[PDB]
Amino acid sequence: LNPLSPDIWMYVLLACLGVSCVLFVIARFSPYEWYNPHPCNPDSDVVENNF
């Protein structure tokens, strides 16, 4: 891991954590990710999660 200087390594770890976290945040605000598992039966509005 010598090629990239130790600065970018920690920058990248923190960036990955931040990007994953903001993706999680936007997942809640998302309109359509709520995808009612097994929509073969629309019987009940079981609005459930992903991401």
Partner: peptide, 9 residues
């Protein structure tokens, strides 16, 4: 209602 529904879950 939208924020509560998508927040508490």
């Amino acid at each position: 209602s939208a924020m509560v529904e998508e927040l508490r879950m």
